[PDB]
Amino acid sequence: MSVVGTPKSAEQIQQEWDTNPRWKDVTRTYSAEDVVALQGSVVEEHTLARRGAEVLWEQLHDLEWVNALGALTGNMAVQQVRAGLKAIYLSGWQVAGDANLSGHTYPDQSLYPANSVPQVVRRINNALQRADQIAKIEGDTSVENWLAPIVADGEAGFGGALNVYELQKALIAAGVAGSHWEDQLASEKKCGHLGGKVLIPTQQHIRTLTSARLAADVADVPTVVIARTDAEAATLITSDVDERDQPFITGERTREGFYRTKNGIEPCIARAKAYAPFADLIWMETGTPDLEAARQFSEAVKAEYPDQMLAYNCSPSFNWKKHLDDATIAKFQKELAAMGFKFQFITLAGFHALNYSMFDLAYGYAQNQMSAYVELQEREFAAEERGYTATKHQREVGAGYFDRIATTVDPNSSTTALTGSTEEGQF
Template sequence: MSICKLDVDAEEKAFQDQIAAVEKEWAQPWRAHIKRPYSAKAIAAMRNTIPLSYPSSLQGRKFWEQLEAHRVAGTCEKTYGTTEPTVMSQMAKHQQTVYVSGALCGLSEVQHPGMDHADYPWDTVPKVVDKLFKAQLWHDQRQNQFRLRHTKAERANLEGYDFMMPIVADADMGFGGLTSTVKLARSFVEAGVAMIHLDDLAIGMKKFTIGEGRTVVPTSEYVSRLTAVRMQFDIMGVDTLLMCRCDTDRSQFITSTIDPRDHAYIIGSTVADIEPLVDAVRAGMAAGRIYQDARDEWKARAGLMTFDDAVKAQAASPDDYDKYVASGATEYGKSLREKRKAATAALGKDVVFDWELSRSKEGSYMWKPTVQAIVERALTVAPLGDMTWARMDAPVWNDIVEFHEGVRKVYPERLFAFGFTGMFDYIKNGFTQEQVESFSSDMAKLGIVWQVQPIYSVSGLNLTVDKFSGAWQKDGIAGYIENISKPSRVPPVVDGFHKASYAGSFLADAFFATVAGEDTSTKQ
C-alpha cells in the first residue's frame, strides 16, 4: 500500500496561515478580555484542515452584544429555564434568551429522573439545546415564509418575533476529566448554544437533607476545567461564550488541599488529642445514634476554625496576632506551611490546628464559605471566561453588593449573572416588599445583566397543568371550549394548531406548491 505524501511546504504555509488566523480572532474586541495560558500555535496545530463554521458562534456574538447593551444601559435580561420548544416559542415574545437548566433536564429529559446531582448522562443538556435550537430554526423559517408571502405594506402589521434567542446552558462540572469536558464543550457548540456555564463543584458530592452543603474542587482544578472549555472553543474557532460560576457561597467542603490559594478557608480542629470526625461518627452510629447527631456532637467539641482564626484565638495578645498579619501570612495564596512558620515566629509557639481530623467520610476537607473566598476565586478565573455568576441560593443583599463591587474593582466592565432560587422567602429573610420589587433593577446597576429563574418549568408548568387537569376532569369538553378554545380564538389569536401561521400550515403547503412550480412569495 502506498503512503500518501503531503506537500510539506504547502502544509507549513497552511499552518502559519492558521496561526495568523487564530491571532486575528483573539484580537477581536469581544475577545480582548480573555487571557489564555496557551499559544495560538498550539491551537492552530489542533484545528481541522478544512474550515468549519457553527451557528453557536453567531449566537455567542449576538448574546455578547445584548449583554453589553444592558451593561451600558444599567438594565438586565430576565429569563427562565425550560426544556420545551412550545414554551420557548412563547418566550420569544418577552425574553431575549432561553436557559436550559441541568436540574430541570434531570427531572424531565432522562430515563431515570432524579434530584440535581448532575448524575444524568453527560450529553443530556446538549441534546436539549439541540432540540430547542432546531425548534427555533423551524419557528424562524415558518414565520419568515409566512411574512414574505405578504406585501411589504401588509408585513408592517404582522407578527415578527426573534425566535433565534441565544440559548444559555448548564454544563455543571464538566462530567469527568478534562477530555470529557472538552467533548462536552464541543457537543454544546455543535448543538447551537450561545453560552455555557461551568461551576467549581465536585462531581457526585451534592447532598441536600443532612445539613451538609456542596463540595467544591480546588482552585487549580477549576482553572483547568475552564481552560479546557476555552481551549475547545478556540480549536473550533467560535465566539461561544463561557460563564464562570462559583458555587463557594454555600459550600461546606473542598476535595483537596493541593492549592495554597484555598488554604485560608479550610477548617480544622484546634483541640489537641481529639479523635478524627470519621471515627467519632462511626462510634456514634455503632452506639445507635444517627449520623447527623454524631457528627454535630463532634463538631461542637472540635473547636473548628480556619488557621488564621486559630492564630488569633491562640495568640497571647492582639500584638502577637498583628505581627502574624504584618508578616504577610494572611495574604492570598499563602500555604499552610508558610502560615505555620509565620505563626510560630509571631506567637513563640506552635498553633494547635489539624485539618485532617475534620475530613468527611468521603475524604473532603471542611470549608468556610465567605464572600472574600468567592471574590478571590472569581478574580482568578475571570480571564478565562466572559461572565461571572456567584451562586447565592440564600441571597443577602450586603453579600451581593460586596461580591460584585469586589470583582468590579479589578474588572470594571465585567458582566455578571444571577440565579433566583424557586422557593426562597425574601420577606422572611429581611427584604421589604419594595426591595423585592426593585431587586432586579438594583442588581442590574451592579452589572448583573443576565438574571434567571432556572427551574420555572417545574413549579410553573406543574401549577398550570394541575389547574387544567382538575378543570378538565370536572367540566370535560364543555369546560375546555369555554375556558380554552373560545378565549384562544379571540384576537389576538393564541398560538396553537388552530392558528395556521404558528402551526406551520403555510410553510407545509409552500413545500407542495414550490415542488409543483408555484411561487408562494409576495403577491404584489
C-alpha cells in the same frame, strides 16, 4: 481537494486575539499554534453557535441587562421569544427532571447522560428556526430575532477536563451561545441550592474554564464562557493542595476523606477574582434573594476587574415572598443590573409553569370535564391581543410551512393540510 473549511493560520488566530475587543480581557494559557494543531484538515462551521454568541455578547453591552427563563422544550423557547425575551436559559436541573436522554426523572446531581443538554440546545434552535420560517411566509415581523442566544448548563463537566472539552464541543455543535461551569466535584454535583456540595480546588476549575475556552477556540466560535462558584454554601472540598483555598481549610476531615471548609461570601470573592481572567461572566450561588449581598459581591469583584460582567440566579428555590416585599421584588432585577449583573435568569421557570398549568387543568378536568378546558381555551383567545398565536395550533407547528414545501414540489397536489382544516373554518 477542496478549500471548504480550510483552517485559519495560527497568525490569523493570534491577530484576532490581539485586535478583536471581544477578547479584551481573556487569558489563554495555551498558544494559537496549540489551537491549530487540534483542528485537523477541516474546521466545521457552526453557524448558530457563532451568531448566537455574537448576538449574546452584543446584547450584554447594548441592553440594560439580558434576562431569560428556563426552557426544557422547543415550544417553551418559542413562546419566550414570542413574548419578547431576548435569550433562553437551558437549565440542567430541568433537563434532569423532565428532559434527559435516560428517560428518567432525576434530581440535579449529574445523573443523566452527558449529551442530554446538547440535544436540548439543538431542539430549541430547531423550534426557533421553525418559528422563524413560519414568520417569513406569514409576513409576521412581530419578532426581530427568533434565533435568540441560548445559555446552556455545563454543570461540573461530567468528569475531567476531557469530559468538559467534549461537552462544550457538543454544545457548540448544537448551536449554543454560552455555557456555564461550576467548581463542584463532578461525582457529587448538586444544584446550587441543594446540600452535600463538594468543591474542587481553585486551580482545577481554572483548568475546567481553560478547557471550555479551548474547545470553543478549536471549533472557532466566540462562545461566552460563564464561571459559577458554589462556595457560599458548600462546606466540603476535595483537597487542600491549592494555597488559594487553604485560608478556609479547617483541617477537619470527613469519613470520605473530604476537607471541611468555611463557606460564605469571602471564598466566593476569592474564587471569583481567580476565575475572572478566564470568564466572560461570573456567577455566585446564594442562599437568599438579597440585593445587599449582591452589591457586596459586585463591589469586591469590580474593585479589581471593573468591566467584569456578572450573572445572577433568580432561583425558584427561594421562597420569594418569605424574604422580599412586593416592591423589592419589582425592582430586584433592575437594581441588580446597576451592579453589573447583566445576565439574569429564572432557572426552573419551565418546570413550575409546566407542572402547575397541567395540575390546574387536570384537577378542574377531573371535577368538571370540558368546562375546565374551555376556561383555558378562552384565556388563549383573550391572549391573542397580546401576541399569543398558539391557539391556531396547526400553523403554530408549521402546517402552512410544509404546505408551502408541498406546493413548491407539486403545485397541483391535492393533499395539503391547512386547506379544509377546522382551523381555517373555526378560528
